[PDB]
Design a protein around this ligand. Sequence first.
Ligand code: HEC
Length: 104
Amino acid sequence: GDVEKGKKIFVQKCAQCHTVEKGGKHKTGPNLHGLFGRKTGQAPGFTYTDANKNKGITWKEETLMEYLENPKKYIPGTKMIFAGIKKKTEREDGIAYLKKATNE
Ligand code: HEC
């Protein structure tokens, strides 16, 4: 698993829901910035979901592993549309890149 490969994975992955590079339009859910640093989905000019506005919790690596169970159980009311990826190895791989992306 390489960082370069991970970046590409996220791109088809879903990136449309997390908007592209800063400059376009706000995405449906926090891309990643402040994922393991900020509270939960409390971005700036970004339109947070009902859950984010409530200030859920900081999505961590380990917490994400368990959260992978019932996405609706963590943030009820939010639906996840799209996702050309599923392979547990693919998802986990992207997370590694995310670890450095937030720290590295
Ligand atoms: C569109 C229908 C989406 C797809 C496909 C993916 N995400 Fe998303 N995500 C989306 C929305 C509208 C929201 C808000 C609340 C929710 O839980 O859906 C989210 C939420 C997240 C967050 C929140 C992070 C934060 O800063 O609070 C993250 C980090 C997130 N979703 C990650 C993620 C990943 C890794 C995806 C592909 C592997 C993915 N989402 C798909 C919108 C959509």
